[PDB]
């Protein structure tokens, strides 16, 4: 008989809670036993187990893996390891399933899990279906085992006999005092490259700065040290790995849909007419240059599940999310992986005689504004998206709602989202002209408009 947990720490593509808040020992517990019988439920009783670097891994873990063997599961405990080693293990162990302790990019006293089951990654209804689980106390009950196993040097020897660096190079790698610290700067010089490592102690307290790489803050130190070391290329991880920012020789933050542009020409060099996909965050560039080298671009949702499960049922070999999320099926799995793509990314430079700044200079480049962000309420927030999907006019634009409204015009687009955890709307827009841009910033504010005359529209 299991008690009541807060269903808000069910997410769409994770469960995520405070330490010793809404999320604790006991709802720890509880998860593992709700995983562990989906598992069953699949017909996969081996389950691999990995935690992040944060302060509350060691004794969370203990009772997510407690919950697992009291369904009986076969736990391969692969201790403290980036999220997509513990994405490797539930690959290339015997169980196909596994389950990640991790809190992200997020504050020191968050916590949280990223499931796997029977090579599934759980999204919405699936997450909610734990939780119904635990509600009513449908669970499985066994005598399961705990193996400890030690993957890291098997991804690390995966990787290094995949890769193939031409030149050498040095590369300053910023970890955020994150769990990549355990393994980006041995691979990344192993590779052939002098590594200045940034803040590469795993230190849960994070006192440098957060591992997320998304906000270009988290980037300062980062760029101040490529232009002072005169380093080819800075890499930035988050927290757990499965994200990876790029800087050039010159200090440009590479944004990941323009590092998808290389990517895709590398992967679509080698697979005529390979699916690419993307997410409705991305340059429109992208559409146009991967059809360019006889790719199919897909445009799908965002969240790392979705374009797992995008990508297995399209066969694309590559995608990638503007939350600095790559993911490669072409010579590897499929999953997000901060740490591959880095080492993909350091394949390809390796192999040009320009610099980093000249190799991503040299990609179209249209005229965008950076994020907007509009906070309205949560009350209103899906209903404003819902109003704009049911009466917004936009012309010869061509639509896109899977997830928010997107509309691409001939030499332009725009976008607008509601943000999942925040009480926010969320715009892009670009352009091939600042004339256009207007243009196109103007349909945008009128559609708003058209809605609320009263909404806050900073543009
Ligand atoms: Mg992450």
Redo the contacts with the bound molecule.
């Keep these: 008989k299991a008690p009541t947990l807060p269903a808000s720490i069910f997410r769409a593509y994770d469960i995520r809670g405070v330490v010793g808040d809404t999320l604790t020992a006991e709802t720890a517990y509880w998860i593992g036993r709700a995983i562990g019988s989906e598992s069953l439920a699949r017909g996969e009783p081996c389950v691999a187990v990995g935690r992040d670097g944060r302060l509350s891994g060691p004794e969370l873990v203990k009772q997510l893996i407690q919950g697992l063997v009291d369904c009986g599961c076969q736990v391969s405990d692969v201790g403290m390891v980036p999220?997509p080693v513990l994405y490797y293990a539930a690959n290339v162990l015997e169980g196909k399933s596994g389950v990640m302790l991790?809190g992200?990019?997020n504050p020191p006293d968050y916590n949280g899990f990223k499931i796997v089951v029977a090579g599934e990654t759980l999204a919405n209804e699936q997450i909610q279906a734990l939780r119904e689980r635990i509600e009513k106390n449908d669970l499985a009950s066994g005598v399961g085992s705990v193996e400890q196993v030690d993957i890291l040097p098997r991804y690390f020897k995966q990787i290094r006999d995949d890769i193939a660096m031409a030149k050498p190079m040095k590369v300053v790698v910023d970890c955020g005092n994150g769990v990549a610290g355990v393994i980006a700067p041995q691979l990344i010089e192993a590779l052939g490259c002098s590594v200045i490592p940034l803040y590469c102690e795993v230190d849960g307290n994070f006192p440098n700065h957060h591992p997320d790489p998304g906000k270009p803050e988290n980037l300062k130190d980062l760029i101040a040290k490529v232009k002072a070391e005169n380093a080819d290329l800075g890499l930035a991880f988050?927290?757990?790995?499965?994200?990876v920012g790029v800087v050039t020789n010159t200090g440009t933050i590479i944004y990941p849909d323009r590092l998808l542009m290389l990517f895709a020409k590398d992967v679509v060099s080698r697979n005529p007419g390979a699916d690419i996909i993307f997410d409705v965050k991305c340059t429109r560039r992208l559409i146009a240059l991967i059809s360019g080298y006889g790719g199919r671009p897909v445009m799908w949702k965002t969240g790392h599940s979705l374009i797992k499960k995008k990508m297995k049922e399209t066969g694309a070999l590559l995608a990638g999310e503007m939350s600095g999320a790559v993911f490669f099926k072409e010579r590897w799995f499929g999953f997000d992986d901060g740490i591959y793509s880095a080492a993909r990314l350091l394949e390809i430079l390796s192999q040009d005689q320009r610099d980093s700044e000249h190799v991503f200079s040299a990609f179209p480049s249209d005229i965008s504004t950076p994020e907007i962000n509009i906070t309205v309420t949560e009350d209103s927030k899906f209903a404003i998206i819902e109003a704009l999907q049911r009466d917004a006019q936009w012309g010869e634009g061509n639509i896109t709602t899977l997830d928010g409204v997107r509309v691409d015009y001939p030499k332009g687009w725009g976008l607008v989202r509601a943000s999942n955890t925040t009480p926010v709307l969320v715009l892009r827009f670009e352009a091939d002209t600042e004339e256009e841009l207007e243009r196109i910033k103007t349909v945008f504010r009128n559609q708003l408009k058209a809605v609320d005359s009263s909404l806050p529209v900073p543009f």
């Design positions: 999220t991790t992200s990019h988050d927290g757990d790995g499965d994200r």
